[PDB]
């Protein structure tokens, strides 16, 4: 429940896996703006240095918005994910996310734009 | 019948333009200079009239207040003015009987009937002749002199 979840977030505030478990429970109980609030507070209160934990919360937010959100918020969180993290990395993750979600056409457009932007130095 | 209440305005006049007047309340419908001068003529042994100031109506048509109540930049009682100090003392002794004509020794029908000004066809039409179409001549002169 929310009380046990707040207890374990008090115990391990860094733990992005229990953060995404918390916002996952909130996307089960379908208060999606509340899940947005959980992942935002994750980005605020997770210990600052832990890049893999913060990018895990980032990828979870991208999955959340491509699942239940809209095009405007997927582009907005795409932008803030770029300005806070590694650009080519978040483009690659949104590529894999569109690959899994089957939105292959907008996937293709993002593939074009990443091979224009970061095709200078990335072979992958 | 319409009742007219007449008392003394004189004990509360410190300003000169309000002097030697009558405190009048509940004037009839569209009470103007002609109606008041006509009733003061019909009173016998009575002096002369000059002007009516503070003629903002608060009874005879509907709404919350009057027209010129507050001075926006910085009770329908009127200040009815007469000729001089001689002329005010002879209108009051003629009002001290008009409240007694109801028990006058011939009948109570000797009081004055008030003939109204009815709003006719083209006369009350003047209300629409100020909202959109007044004469274009006077409105050109009043605006330029205040700016100069």
């Amino acid at each position: 429940t929310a009380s046990d979840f707040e207890r374990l977030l008090l115990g391990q505030p860094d733990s992005s896996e229990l953060w995404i478990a918390y916002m996952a429970s909130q996307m089960q109980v379908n208060d999606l703006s509340s899940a947005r609030q959980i992942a935002e507070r994750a980005l605020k209160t997770i210990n600052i240095r832990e890049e893999t934990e913060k990018l895990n919360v980032w990828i979870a937010y991208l999955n959340l918005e491509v699942a239940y959100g809209t095009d405007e918020t997927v582009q907005e969180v795409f932008k803030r994910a770029c300005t806070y993290n590694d650009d080519r990395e978040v483009h690659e993750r949104l590529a894999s996310i569109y690959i899994q979600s089957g939105k292959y056409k907008e996937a293709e457009d993002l593939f074009e734009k990443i091979v224009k932007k970061y095709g200078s130095e990335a072979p992958h | 019948v319409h009742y007219l209440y007449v008392r003394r305005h004189a004990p509360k006049i410190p300003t000169p333009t309000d002097s030697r007047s009558l405190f009048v309340t509940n004037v009839p419908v569209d009470s103007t200079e002609a109606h008041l001068r006509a009733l003061v003529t019909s009173l016998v042994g009575t002096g002369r009239f000059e002007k009516v100031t503070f003629e903002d109506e608060s009874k005879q048509e509907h709404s919350l207040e009057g027209k010129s109540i507050i001075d926006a930049a910085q009770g329908s009682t009127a200040v009815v003015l007469l000729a001089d100090e001689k002329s005010v003392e002879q209108v009051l002794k003629a009002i001290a009987k008009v409240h007694k004509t109801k028990k006058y020794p011939v009948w109570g029908g000797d009081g004055l009937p008030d003939s109204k000004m009815p709003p006719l066809g083209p006369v009350w039409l003047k209300s629409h002749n100020r909202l959109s179409f007044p004469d274009p001549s006077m409105l050109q002169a009043s605006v330029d002199a205040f700016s100069t």
Partner: protein, 1061 residues
Amino acid sequence: RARAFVLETEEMLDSVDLDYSEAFDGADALLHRLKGSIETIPAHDAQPLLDAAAKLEKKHKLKVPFPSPPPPQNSNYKVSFATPAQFNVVGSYVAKTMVRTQSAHGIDMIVVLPESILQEKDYLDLRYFYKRAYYLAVVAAHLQKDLKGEATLSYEYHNGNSLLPVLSVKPNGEKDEDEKKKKKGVLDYRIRIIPCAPESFFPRQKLHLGAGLVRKHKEGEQQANGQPATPATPFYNSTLVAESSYLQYLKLLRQTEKKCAAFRNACILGRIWLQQRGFGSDVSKGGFGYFEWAVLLALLLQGGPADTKGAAPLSPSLSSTQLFKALIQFLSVTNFAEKPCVLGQAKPDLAGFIENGPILWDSARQLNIAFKMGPWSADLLHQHARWTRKLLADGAVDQFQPTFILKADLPTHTYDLVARMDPEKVSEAAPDKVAHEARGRHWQVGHKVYRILRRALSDKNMEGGERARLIHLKVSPGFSSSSWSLNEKPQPQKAGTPIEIGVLFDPLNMARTVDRGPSAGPSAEEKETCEKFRRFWGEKSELRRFGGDTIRETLVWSAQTPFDLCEEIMRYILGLHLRVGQLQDDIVFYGRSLPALLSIKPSDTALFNVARKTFTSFERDLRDLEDLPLRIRHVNPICPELRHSSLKTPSFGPSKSGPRPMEVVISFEASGKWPESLIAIQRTKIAFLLMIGRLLERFKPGEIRTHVGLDDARYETENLAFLDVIYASGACFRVRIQADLEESLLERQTKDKTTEQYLRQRASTQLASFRRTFVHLPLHTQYITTATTRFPALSPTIRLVKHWFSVHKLSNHFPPELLELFVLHTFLAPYPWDVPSSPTTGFLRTLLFLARWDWRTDPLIIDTLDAWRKLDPGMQHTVLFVATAHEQSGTMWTSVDGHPRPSKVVAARMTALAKSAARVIREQGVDLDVRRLFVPSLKEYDVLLYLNTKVLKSALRTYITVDPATEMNGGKGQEIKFKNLAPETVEPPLPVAQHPVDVLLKQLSAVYDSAAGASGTGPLVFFRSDTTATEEGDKVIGAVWNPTLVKRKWRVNLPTSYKPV
């Protein structure tokens, strides 16, 4: 949101909860006694048809077969009655999920026939249904002889199923703790004995939907690659598998209860959802109820998604709020409203969502739970599910109490029809042959009306966009008896079948003259020669060239005033395919103020033409290009004519009209040269306006003329002046200037005058009235002009509500934007009803909600408080509270004009006429006697005075471009002309032809009120004397003395005509 929902669900449950002494013993007494009785009734010999009929004629109770009954030539088998072997309770009672339903409910009990009386072939040719109704008559007559004649009885159908006859017992009396059970109208109101089959006797794989178990033809039904030749009979096969499977869903529902006991509260909230949505388990209403809701919630708690994941907001450790919410959003988006008819099927455990075929299938039993569902109920459930997922999606307002009533079932266009299909071959074009009898379960005519009207109103564009005049369809058979007496085999009806057709239209494509189709084919394609078109249309199929340069099959209708092109489609399509049975629609609210132009009445073109195009050419560009010492910033149209709200749809010319002077705002640049006082800043505005005037009169558009006139709309501001331009197309535009220092100087002049202590209220009145006339109208008309494109009924709804208030003597004090936002409350917040797709329906919901809204505890809010209610407990200065995101104060258009507000004044008669205007609807109905709304009662008035105008014939009617008063010949065409109204002189005789009673009570609106308060026909805002000085009304004034004056003492600030006593 969730906490408020669980608390409000708890208070609802506490309100609708039960009593234990009610349940046990009130139900248990009759259940135990009646089971004893049915175990004591005896069994008899296996008897044939002739012996059955021989005992059934001479016993008082009668057999109940559905047509067709079996003949002795076609019936070779035997029918026997045997002893009952088992008992169970099914439905809501064994679950204990019941509530106190005020109308009726009844618990079912299951008495299953034994194994030995059945034959393995009995699932063909109705033989089992006949022996079931034989079981019925025998068990019933033996109940008649064991009860000693104290309880009464009727025959009935279960769930509306015409092939499932039942008997329904009724009690008669009440003692303390005896057998009789009258006082308990939910659990003891009804007891229904359902005859049914044991489990797994008949082959279910043959009992499939696509298998036709009614064999009528034998020649040519083979050699067709399997069995598509024998037609499928889904209702009949589904009835068979359901009555053979009443037990499995019982025990499945119980194991879902005891693995989640929130199922009680979820089904209870679902029950209130369905009784208030009007649905039920009956065949006439879709057949959605407790059974379907409960087994579908069981199915989605044991699955539902595509990859067989457990349904995310449906864990067994959850609560009823989220269980109901998840059920609503699954009916909304996944596969439970319309997609189980067009785009997919779902499974039982392990449950899944697959994208093919219309069925709500369960596999190990092979049954569609939605077998009684049609595409009509599909689209109805879709709209209800979408509206409910948005209502559970919002987070600002409370949304448990407003719950949906189906205005889509009951719109204004309930086209009543008589259809006498006697005989069937001369009064029905569709052949009701043995194949149609084998297919349909008694609802032949229902399926035909649904199908015919959907292909009648369906259109199809060039680019594949399915766009129609139809979204939801319904056929509700009024006068359909599901219960009947004891001495008769079918239900007989001698008054025919009434067919209502309740249609919610689509207003974006409702008034389009064209009906579209497929590509005009070179070779006749199958949709060119199909049952949607040229044969199905007849004489009205032609060829028309379009604007997209491709030739298509086209239909051309007529646009007219009093009724609709949709109605014309209805009349001709029913008369051509269903039959020549008559059709009527006399509900008359389209007789509004009718604009006099070419092609009466004009659609949303006239207002556009006059205001917008004459305001483009020529006022805007010349006034912007005009050289002046102070440069113009904004010229913004702000009239009800722009924001789609004018009562008169105006034309070129009509200077006699009230709404024809168009009020508009123009401001200059930020300059500090304006003076620091009212009369000085207004004379600067007069100077600027006269310079605009002289330039526009000497320029080349000099056919236009100008003039400068004063105003009396704003109090204590007597040197306001305007430019009202008279365009060559008869336009009129009231112009006004704003100034930021003018706003702040009215602010300071309200701030001053401290030493008198009694002028602050009048100062605030002047302030907020200035705020009305200047500030908010720009953004308000922007909001409504954006809302216009999505709500196309808004302009005629505003005309109907404003015309109602015009005949009910209220808009002389009520501002127009007040009523505008009042119709916008039921537009942008349409809860708890559907989208207003019709002007008359909009007038009705404004009437309904103004009648059902209380001003005492409920403030309205709209997406287009706790500090004022403390000092005014009796609401003597305010009654209405009108607020949104635009105005957060709620006191701008309500308390500033100066409404008297005790219980017996102008503002108090808004509430009294809205209650009584709905009492004409429920009792007698809606007919030609609905003309009593548009007449005044003229009662409770202290003094009534009759006025007369000095007008000739048809004045002022013709010069407002509205056409009553037929003594002008040619008002139905273009006889009247408006270019002669362009005057030679600007004095009289141009304003002589205005209304001398309109402005008679403008100046009679300036002096008293502390004595009296009245309302007349005149100063009704933006309204003329065209329609209320004729048969439709009368020009009266009605005065009521205020209750605060009965007698008082002689004072000075008195104002009243008072007499001495």
